[PDB]
A paper describes a structure:
One unsealed C:G pair, one unsealed C:T pair, and one sealed C:T pair were, respectively, captured at the catalytic sites of the three catalytic form structures, referred to as [name]:CG, [name]:CT1, and [name]:CT2 hereafter. Our structures represent several different states of the reaction: the [name]:CG complex structure captured the Watson–Crick C:G pair prior to ligation, whereas [name]:CT1 and [name]:CT2 captured the mismatched C:T pair prior to and after the ligation process, respectively. The structures belong to two different space groups: P212121 for [name]:CT2 and P21 for both [name]:CG and [name]:CT1. However, as indicated by the low root mean square deviation values (rmsd, about 0.75 Å based on the superposition of 404 pairs of Cα atoms) among them, the three complex structures are very similar to each other. Unlike the extended non-catalytic structure, [name] undergoes large domain rearrangement and adopts a closed conformation in the catalytic [name]:DNA complex. [name] is assembled like a ring-shaped clamp and encircles the DNA duplex in its central channel. Though not identical, the overall shapes and orientations of the C:T pair in [name]:CT1 and the C:G pair in [name]:CG are similar. Mismatched C:T pair and Watson–Crick C:G pair have similar conformations in the [name]:CT1 and [name]:CG structures.
[name] catalyzes the DNA ligation reaction during the base excision repair (BER) process of ASFV genome. [name] is composed of 419 amino acids and is one of the smallest DNA ligases identified to date. However, unlike the homologous proteins (such as HsLIG1 and SusLIG1), the fidelity of [name] is very low. By solving four [name]:DNA complex structures, including the non-catalytic open form and the catalytic closed forms, we showed that the NTD, AD, and OB domains of [name] undergo a large conformational change during the catalytic assembly.
Numbering used by the authors: 0 to 116, 120 to 411
Write the structure that this text describes.
DNA sequence: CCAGTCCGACCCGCATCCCGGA
DNA sequence: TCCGGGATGCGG
DNA sequence: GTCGGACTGG
Protein backbone atom coordinates (compact mmCIF):
# COMPACT_ATOMS: atom_id res chain seq x y z
CA UNK A 1 0.00 0.00 0.00
CA UNK A 2 2.70 2.46 1.01
CA UNK A 3 4.98 1.73 -1.97
CA UNK A 4 2.19 3.20 -4.12
CA UNK A 5 2.93 6.66 -2.67
CA UNK A 6 6.16 6.71 -4.73
CA UNK A 7 6.32 6.34 -8.53
CA UNK A 8 7.87 3.22 -10.01
CA UNK A 9 7.72 -0.57 -10.10
CA UNK A 10 8.41 -3.15 -7.38
CA UNK A 11 9.99 -6.44 -8.48
CA UNK A 12 12.32 -8.96 -6.81
CA UNK A 13 11.94 -6.99 -3.55
CA UNK A 14 13.75 -4.10 -5.26
CA UNK A 15 11.87 -0.84 -5.84
CA UNK A 16 13.08 0.90 -9.02
CA UNK A 17 11.90 4.42 -9.78
CA UNK A 18 10.97 4.99 -13.44
CA UNK A 19 14.01 5.70 -15.62
CA UNK A 20 14.97 9.31 -16.23
CA UNK A 21 15.80 9.57 -19.94
CA UNK A 22 18.08 12.26 -21.34
CA UNK A 23 20.12 13.05 -24.44
CA UNK A 24 23.92 13.07 -24.40
CA UNK A 25 26.01 15.63 -26.27
CA UNK A 26 26.92 12.95 -28.83
CA UNK A 27 23.19 12.46 -29.45
CA UNK A 28 22.70 9.05 -27.83
CA UNK A 29 19.91 8.54 -25.33
CA UNK A 30 20.78 7.72 -21.73
CA UNK A 31 18.79 6.24 -18.85
CA UNK A 32 19.15 6.93 -15.12
CA UNK A 33 17.48 4.52 -12.68
CA UNK A 34 17.58 4.84 -8.88
CA UNK A 35 16.57 1.85 -6.76
CA UNK A 36 15.91 1.02 -3.11
CA UNK A 37 16.58 -2.37 -1.53
CA UNK A 38 16.81 -3.57 2.08
CA UNK A 39 19.45 -6.10 3.15
CA UNK A 40 19.38 -8.09 6.40
CA UNK A 41 22.07 -10.68 7.12
CA UNK A 42 23.71 -10.05 3.72
CA UNK A 43 20.57 -11.01 1.76
CA UNK A 44 17.76 -9.03 0.15
CA UNK A 45 14.46 -9.22 2.04
CA UNK A 46 11.01 -7.91 0.99
CA UNK A 47 9.96 -4.35 1.80
CA UNK A 48 6.95 -4.74 4.07
CA UNK A 49 4.47 -2.00 4.89
CA UNK A 50 5.47 -2.37 8.55
CA UNK A 51 9.03 -1.50 7.49
CA UNK A 52 7.84 2.14 7.48
CA UNK A 53 6.90 2.25 11.19
CA UNK A 54 9.42 -0.14 12.79
CA UNK A 55 13.04 -0.93 11.96
CA UNK A 56 14.06 -4.54 11.40
CA UNK A 57 17.04 -5.68 13.46
CA UNK A 58 20.27 -5.86 11.42
CA UNK A 59 18.43 -4.44 8.38
CA UNK A 60 20.10 -1.70 6.34
CA UNK A 61 18.40 0.24 3.56
CA UNK A 62 20.59 0.46 0.45
CA UNK A 63 20.20 3.15 -2.22
CA UNK A 64 21.98 2.51 -5.52
CA UNK A 65 21.47 3.75 -9.04
CA UNK A 66 22.04 2.68 -12.65
CA UNK A 67 23.16 4.80 -15.60
CA UNK A 68 23.81 3.61 -19.14
CA UNK A 69 24.07 5.05 -22.62
CA UNK A 70 21.72 3.37 -25.10
CA UNK A 71 23.23 -0.05 -25.91
CA UNK A 72 26.20 0.91 -23.72
CA UNK A 73 27.83 -0.38 -20.57
CA UNK A 74 25.75 -0.34 -17.39
CA UNK A 75 27.39 1.60 -14.55
CA UNK A 76 26.08 0.94 -11.04
CA UNK A 77 27.08 3.13 -8.11
CA UNK A 78 28.22 1.80 -4.76
CA UNK A 79 25.49 1.28 -2.19
CA UNK A 80 24.33 4.19 -0.06
CA UNK A 81 23.71 2.46 3.28
CA UNK A 82 20.92 3.97 5.38
CA UNK A 83 21.46 2.44 8.82
CA UNK A 84 19.07 4.62 10.86
CA UNK A 85 16.29 7.16 10.53
CA UNK A 86 16.34 10.87 11.26
CA UNK A 87 14.64 13.00 13.91
CA UNK A 88 14.81 9.77 15.91
CA UNK A 89 13.63 11.49 19.10
CA UNK A 90 10.56 13.39 17.93
CA UNK A 91 7.14 13.02 16.34
CA UNK A 92 8.93 13.60 13.00
CA UNK A 93 10.95 10.39 13.40
CA UNK A 94 11.37 8.40 10.20
CA UNK A 95 12.32 4.74 9.81
CA UNK A 96 15.46 3.28 8.18
CA UNK A 97 13.36 2.21 5.19
CA UNK A 98 11.10 5.28 5.11
CA UNK A 99 14.06 7.67 5.26
CA UNK A 100 15.78 5.82 2.41
CA UNK A 101 12.70 6.30 0.23
CA UNK A 102 12.58 10.00 1.13
CA UNK A 103 16.26 10.27 0.17
CA UNK A 104 15.73 8.27 -3.03
CA UNK A 105 12.61 10.23 -3.99
CA UNK A 106 14.51 13.47 -3.36
CA UNK A 107 17.33 12.37 -5.67
CA UNK A 108 14.75 11.27 -8.25
CA UNK A 109 12.95 14.63 -8.34
CA UNK A 110 16.06 16.81 -8.54
CA UNK A 111 17.86 14.58 -11.05
CA UNK A 112 15.21 15.46 -13.65
CA UNK A 113 16.74 18.96 -13.82
CA UNK A 114 19.47 20.20 -16.19
CA UNK A 115 18.79 17.24 -18.50
CA UNK A 116 18.60 17.40 -22.29
CA UNK A 117 15.12 16.12 -23.14
CA UNK A 118 11.14 22.50 -19.60
CA UNK A 119 9.09 25.69 -19.24
CA UNK A 120 11.58 27.00 -21.81
CA UNK A 121 14.37 26.90 -19.23
CA UNK A 122 17.79 26.29 -20.80
CA UNK A 123 20.71 25.70 -18.39
CA UNK A 124 23.42 28.37 -18.65
CA UNK A 125 26.75 27.65 -20.30
CA UNK A 126 29.55 26.62 -17.94
CA UNK A 127 33.30 27.25 -18.07
CA UNK A 128 35.76 24.40 -18.60
CA UNK A 129 39.24 25.93 -18.34
CA UNK A 130 40.64 27.39 -15.11
CA UNK A 131 43.68 29.71 -15.23
CA UNK A 132 44.48 28.30 -18.69
CA UNK A 133 43.78 29.95 -22.04
CA UNK A 134 44.07 27.44 -24.93
CA UNK A 135 46.28 28.61 -27.78
CA UNK A 136 43.41 27.96 -30.22
CA UNK A 137 41.65 30.99 -28.72
CA UNK A 138 44.08 33.17 -30.70
CA UNK A 139 44.15 30.98 -33.84
CA UNK A 140 40.66 32.01 -35.00
CA UNK A 141 39.30 34.63 -37.38
CA UNK A 142 38.65 37.01 -34.46
CA UNK A 143 40.37 37.82 -31.18
CA UNK A 144 38.78 36.50 -27.97
CA UNK A 145 36.80 38.70 -25.60
CA UNK A 146 37.80 39.21 -21.96
CA UNK A 147 35.12 40.12 -19.41
CA UNK A 148 34.99 40.69 -15.68
CA UNK A 149 34.06 37.72 -13.50
CA UNK A 150 31.71 38.66 -10.65
CA UNK A 151 31.44 36.58 -7.46
CA UNK A 152 27.66 36.30 -7.21
CA UNK A 153 24.88 34.04 -8.46
CA UNK A 154 24.24 32.85 -12.01
CA UNK A 155 20.90 33.71 -13.60
CA UNK A 156 19.28 33.57 -17.03
CA UNK A 157 16.35 35.78 -18.04
CA UNK A 158 13.63 35.10 -20.60
CA UNK A 159 9.99 36.01 -21.22
CA UNK A 160 7.30 33.33 -21.06
CA UNK A 161 4.17 33.22 -23.21
CA UNK A 162 2.44 35.68 -20.90
CA UNK A 163 4.10 38.99 -20.13
CA UNK A 164 5.91 37.45 -17.16
CA UNK A 165 9.72 37.47 -16.98
CA UNK A 166 11.43 34.21 -16.00
CA UNK A 167 14.62 34.37 -13.91
CA UNK A 168 16.20 30.96 -13.30
CA UNK A 169 19.48 29.61 -12.00
CA UNK A 170 22.32 27.25 -12.93
CA UNK A 171 20.21 24.16 -12.13
CA UNK A 172 17.02 25.60 -13.71
CA UNK A 173 15.46 26.76 -10.44
CA UNK A 174 13.18 29.78 -10.78
CA UNK A 175 14.30 32.75 -8.71
CA UNK A 176 11.68 34.45 -6.55
CA UNK A 177 11.73 38.09 -5.54
CA UNK A 178 14.27 40.21 -7.42
CA UNK A 179 11.46 42.54 -8.46
CA UNK A 180 13.78 45.47 -9.19
CA UNK A 181 15.44 43.33 -11.87
CA UNK A 182 12.24 41.83 -13.28
CA UNK A 183 10.51 45.20 -13.71
CA UNK A 184 13.44 46.62 -15.70
CA UNK A 185 13.63 43.33 -17.62
CA UNK A 186 9.92 43.65 -18.43
CA UNK A 187 10.65 47.11 -19.84
CA UNK A 188 13.74 46.01 -21.76
CA UNK A 189 11.74 43.21 -23.40
CA UNK A 190 9.45 45.84 -24.95
CA UNK A 191 12.31 47.07 -27.16
CA UNK A 192 13.99 43.78 -28.18
CA UNK A 193 13.16 40.36 -29.61
CA UNK A 194 10.95 38.60 -27.07
CA UNK A 195 12.62 35.18 -27.47
CA UNK A 196 16.18 36.17 -26.53
CA UNK A 197 17.72 34.82 -23.33
CA UNK A 198 19.70 37.31 -21.22
CA UNK A 199 22.53 35.40 -19.53
CA UNK A 200 24.29 37.09 -16.65
CA UNK A 201 25.08 37.52 -13.00
CA UNK A 202 23.11 38.53 -9.92
CA UNK A 203 25.55 40.71 -8.04
CA UNK A 204 26.15 43.79 -5.91
CA UNK A 205 29.73 45.03 -5.76
CA UNK A 206 31.61 44.86 -2.42
CA UNK A 207 28.88 42.58 -1.02
CA UNK A 208 30.06 39.03 -0.25
CA UNK A 209 28.83 36.04 -2.23
CA UNK A 210 27.10 34.68 0.88
CA UNK A 211 24.88 37.76 1.17
CA UNK A 212 24.23 37.83 -2.59
CA UNK A 213 23.25 34.15 -2.60
CA UNK A 214 21.02 34.71 0.44
CA UNK A 215 19.08 37.50 -1.25
CA UNK A 216 18.67 35.51 -4.47
CA UNK A 217 17.52 32.30 -2.76
CA UNK A 218 15.16 33.85 -0.21
CA UNK A 219 11.50 34.14 -1.17
CA UNK A 220 11.81 37.92 -0.71
CA UNK A 221 14.79 40.26 -0.66
CA UNK A 222 15.74 43.89 -0.07
CA UNK A 223 15.51 44.57 -3.84
CA UNK A 224 19.10 45.85 -3.93
CA UNK A 225 20.77 43.42 -6.37
CA UNK A 226 21.85 44.14 -9.94
CA UNK A 227 21.81 41.97 -13.07
CA UNK A 228 25.03 42.17 -15.11
CA UNK A 229 24.42 40.55 -18.50
CA UNK A 230 27.43 39.05 -20.29
CA UNK A 231 25.83 36.90 -23.02
CA UNK A 232 22.62 36.23 -24.92
CA UNK A 233 21.26 33.51 -27.18
CA UNK A 234 18.19 32.18 -28.97
CA UNK A 235 16.86 28.67 -28.45
CA UNK A 236 16.89 27.86 -32.19
CA UNK A 237 20.28 29.48 -32.96
CA UNK A 238 22.56 28.06 -30.27
CA UNK A 239 25.42 27.70 -32.79
CA UNK A 240 25.61 31.49 -33.17
CA UNK A 241 29.28 32.38 -32.55
CA UNK A 242 30.27 34.29 -29.43
CA UNK A 243 31.37 37.49 -31.18
CA UNK A 244 28.00 37.64 -32.95
CA UNK A 245 26.10 37.10 -29.69
CA UNK A 246 28.11 39.89 -28.08
CA UNK A 247 27.39 42.25 -30.98
CA UNK A 248 23.65 41.58 -30.78
CA UNK A 249 23.76 41.94 -26.99
CA UNK A 250 25.39 45.35 -27.41
CA UNK A 251 22.54 46.43 -29.69
CA UNK A 252 20.07 45.16 -27.08
CA UNK A 253 21.43 47.53 -24.43
CA UNK A 254 21.48 50.31 -27.04
CA UNK A 255 17.66 50.19 -26.96
CA UNK A 256 17.24 51.54 -23.41
CA UNK A 257 19.56 53.64 -21.24
CA UNK A 258 16.91 54.10 -18.52
CA UNK A 259 18.23 51.05 -16.66
CA UNK A 260 19.38 51.30 -13.05
CA UNK A 261 19.79 47.61 -12.14
CA UNK A 262 20.58 45.96 -15.50
CA UNK A 263 23.95 46.53 -17.17
CA UNK A 264 25.92 44.88 -19.95
CA UNK A 265 29.28 43.41 -18.95
CA UNK A 266 32.07 45.32 -20.66
CA UNK A 267 33.95 43.48 -23.41
CA UNK A 268 37.73 43.75 -23.83
CA UNK A 269 39.51 42.41 -26.90
CA UNK A 270 42.90 40.80 -26.33
CA UNK A 271 45.48 39.86 -28.96
CA UNK A 272 47.50 37.52 -26.70
CA UNK A 273 47.61 35.95 -23.25
CA UNK A 274 49.54 38.77 -21.58
CA UNK A 275 46.78 41.29 -22.27
CA UNK A 276 44.17 38.92 -20.85
CA UNK A 277 46.40 38.44 -17.81
CA UNK A 278 46.90 42.20 -17.41
CA UNK A 279 43.12 42.60 -17.34
CA UNK A 280 42.87 39.82 -14.74
CA UNK A 281 45.27 41.64 -12.41
CA UNK A 282 43.42 44.91 -13.03
CA UNK A 283 40.05 43.32 -12.26
CA UNK A 284 41.43 41.87 -9.02
CA UNK A 285 42.70 45.34 -8.11
CA UNK A 286 39.18 46.66 -8.74
CA UNK A 287 37.90 43.99 -6.34
CA UNK A 288 36.43 41.50 -8.81
CA UNK A 289 36.73 37.72 -8.76
CA UNK A 290 38.75 37.63 -11.97
CA UNK A 291 38.34 37.53 -15.74
CA UNK A 292 36.38 35.41 -18.21
CA UNK A 293 37.90 34.65 -21.62
CA UNK A 294 35.45 33.82 -24.41
CA UNK A 295 36.59 32.29 -27.69
CA UNK A 296 35.21 34.39 -30.54
CA UNK A 297 33.85 31.38 -32.47
CA UNK A 298 32.31 29.45 -29.57
CA UNK A 299 28.63 28.59 -29.82
CA UNK A 300 26.32 28.72 -26.82
CA UNK A 301 26.55 25.26 -25.24
CA UNK A 302 23.99 24.93 -22.42
CA UNK A 303 24.85 23.23 -19.16
CA UNK A 304 23.05 20.00 -20.05
CA UNK A 305 24.44 17.18 -17.89
CA UNK A 306 26.58 19.88 -16.21
CA UNK A 307 28.50 20.35 -19.45
CA UNK A 308 31.46 22.74 -19.34
CA UNK A 309 32.18 24.56 -22.59
CA UNK A 310 35.72 24.29 -23.96
CA UNK A 311 35.35 27.76 -25.53
CA UNK A 312 35.45 29.59 -22.17
CA UNK A 313 38.30 30.20 -19.74
CA UNK A 314 38.23 31.25 -16.09
CA UNK A 315 41.10 33.45 -14.88
CA UNK A 316 40.85 33.74 -11.10
CA UNK A 317 43.46 33.61 -8.31
CA UNK A 318 43.99 30.27 -6.58
CA UNK A 319 44.72 30.80 -2.89
CA UNK A 320 46.92 28.43 -0.88
CA UNK A 321 46.97 28.58 2.92
CA UNK A 322 47.99 26.42 5.88
CA UNK A 323 45.72 25.05 8.60
CA UNK A 324 46.35 22.94 11.69
CA UNK A 325 45.09 19.38 11.34
CA UNK A 326 43.16 18.35 14.45
CA UNK A 327 40.95 15.34 13.56
CA UNK A 328 39.73 13.11 10.77
CA UNK A 329 36.50 11.57 9.59
CA UNK A 330 34.87 9.91 6.58
CA UNK A 331 32.15 10.32 4.02
CA UNK A 332 28.73 8.85 4.69
CA UNK A 333 27.19 7.85 1.35
CA UNK A 334 28.15 5.70 -1.61
CA UNK A 335 31.77 5.69 -2.73
CA UNK A 336 32.81 8.04 0.09
CA UNK A 337 31.82 5.82 3.02
CA UNK A 338 35.11 4.83 4.62
CA UNK A 339 37.03 7.43 2.58
CA UNK A 340 39.26 9.71 4.64
CA UNK A 341 38.35 13.35 5.29
CA UNK A 342 40.50 15.83 7.19
CA UNK A 343 39.35 18.15 9.98
CA UNK A 344 41.23 21.40 10.61
CA UNK A 345 40.91 24.06 13.32
CA UNK A 346 41.18 27.82 12.93
CA UNK A 347 42.73 30.27 15.42
CA UNK A 348 39.20 31.21 16.54
CA UNK A 349 38.67 27.51 17.50
CA UNK A 350 36.25 26.94 14.59
CA UNK A 351 36.60 23.64 12.73
CA UNK A 352 35.88 22.53 9.18
CA UNK A 353 36.22 19.45 6.97
CA UNK A 354 38.47 19.35 3.89
CA UNK A 355 38.18 16.75 1.14
CA UNK A 356 41.62 15.43 0.08
CA UNK A 357 42.71 16.20 -3.50
CA UNK A 358 45.35 14.35 -5.57
CA UNK A 359 44.58 11.15 -3.62
CA UNK A 360 43.03 8.03 -5.07
CA UNK A 361 39.97 6.54 -3.42
CA UNK A 362 42.22 3.55 -2.74
CA UNK A 363 44.47 5.85 -0.70
CA UNK A 364 41.46 7.40 1.05
CA UNK A 365 39.98 3.99 1.89
CA UNK A 366 43.34 2.77 3.19
CA UNK A 367 44.10 5.87 5.28
CA UNK A 368 40.77 5.64 7.10
CA UNK A 369 41.33 1.89 7.58
CA UNK A 370 44.86 1.83 9.04
CA UNK A 371 44.29 4.76 11.43
CA UNK A 372 42.60 5.13 14.83
CA UNK A 373 42.59 8.06 17.33
CA UNK A 374 45.63 6.51 19.05
CA UNK A 375 47.86 6.48 15.98
CA UNK A 376 46.39 9.76 14.72
CA UNK A 377 47.34 11.57 17.94
CA UNK A 378 50.92 10.32 17.61
CA UNK A 379 51.61 11.49 14.06
CA UNK A 380 49.23 13.59 12.01
CA UNK A 381 47.59 15.64 14.78
CA UNK A 382 49.07 19.13 14.75
CA UNK A 383 50.60 19.13 11.27
CA UNK A 384 50.04 21.89 8.73
CA UNK A 385 47.69 20.91 5.89
CA UNK A 386 48.07 22.80 2.61
CA UNK A 387 44.58 23.85 1.49
CA UNK A 388 43.64 25.24 -1.92
CA UNK A 389 40.54 27.43 -1.76
CA UNK A 390 38.79 30.32 -3.50
CA UNK A 391 37.91 32.73 -0.67
CA UNK A 392 37.60 32.95 3.11
CA UNK A 393 34.23 32.79 4.81
CA UNK A 394 33.70 36.42 5.91
CA UNK A 395 31.90 35.57 9.17
CA UNK A 396 34.08 32.63 10.27
CA UNK A 397 37.43 32.75 8.45
CA UNK A 398 36.86 29.23 7.09
CA UNK A 399 38.33 28.64 3.60
CA UNK A 400 35.51 28.12 1.10
CA UNK A 401 35.54 25.66 -1.80
CA UNK A 402 38.52 24.05 -0.07
CA UNK A 403 40.40 20.88 -0.97
CA UNK A 404 43.43 19.37 0.73
CA UNK A 405 46.47 19.02 -1.54
CA UNK A 406 48.90 17.62 1.04
CA UNK A 407 51.06 18.40 4.05
CA UNK A 408 54.13 20.58 4.35
CA UNK A 409 56.56 17.65 4.70
C1' DC B 1 45.82 5.29 -26.51
C1' DC B 2 43.85 9.64 -25.25
C1' DA B 3 40.47 13.60 -24.30
C1' DG B 4 35.84 14.26 -24.03
C1' DT B 5 31.59 13.36 -21.13
C1' DC B 6 29.15 12.19 -17.31
C1' DC B 7 28.15 10.72 -12.84
C1' DG B 8 28.43 10.90 -7.78
C1' DA B 9 30.56 12.08 -3.74
C1' DC B 10 32.22 16.03 -0.68
C1' DC B 11 33.03 21.22 1.27
C1' DC B 12 30.57 26.01 3.78
C1' DG B 13 26.74 29.55 3.94
C1' DC B 14 22.08 30.78 3.71
C1' DA B 15 16.87 30.21 3.81
C1' DT B 16 12.95 27.89 5.35
C1' DC B 17 10.13 24.51 7.72
C1' DC B 18 8.95 21.48 11.85
C1' DC B 19 9.71 20.77 15.93
C1' DG B 20 9.93 20.97 21.27
C1' DG B 21 12.12 22.92 25.67
C1' DA B 22 13.84 27.06 28.50
C1' DT C 1 5.69 32.36 23.00
C1' DC C 2 10.34 32.23 21.07
C1' DC C 3 14.52 31.02 20.48
C1' DG C 4 17.53 26.87 19.40
C1' DG C 5 18.35 22.34 16.79
C1' DG C 6 17.48 19.08 12.92
C1' DA C 7 16.47 18.43 8.29
C1' DT C 8 16.29 19.85 3.60
C1' DG C 9 17.64 22.10 -0.63
C1' DC C 10 19.25 26.05 -2.84
C1' DG C 11 23.96 28.89 -4.06
C1' DG C 12 29.17 28.99 -4.70
C1' DG D 1 31.62 25.16 -6.22
C1' DT D 2 35.43 21.32 -5.91
C1' DC D 3 37.10 16.59 -7.23
C1' DG D 4 38.01 11.23 -8.75
C1' DG D 5 36.56 7.49 -11.64
C1' DA D 6 34.46 5.22 -15.32
C1' DC D 7 32.65 5.05 -19.55
C1' DT D 8 32.48 7.14 -24.41
C1' DG D 9 34.07 8.02 -29.08
C1' DG D 10 37.26 7.87 -31.75
Amino acid sequence: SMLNQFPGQYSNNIFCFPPIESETKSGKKASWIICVQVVQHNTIIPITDEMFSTDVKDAVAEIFTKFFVEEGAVRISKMTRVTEGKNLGKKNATTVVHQAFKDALSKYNRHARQKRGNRGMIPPMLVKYFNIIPKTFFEEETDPIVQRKRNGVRAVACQQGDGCILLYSRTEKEFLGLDNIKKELKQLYLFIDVRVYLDGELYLHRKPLQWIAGQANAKTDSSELHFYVFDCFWSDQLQMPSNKRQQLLTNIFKQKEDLTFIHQVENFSVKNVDEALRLKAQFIKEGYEGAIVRNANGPYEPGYNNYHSAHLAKLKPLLDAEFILVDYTQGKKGKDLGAILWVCELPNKKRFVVTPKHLTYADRYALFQKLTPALFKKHLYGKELTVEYAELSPKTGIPLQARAVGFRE
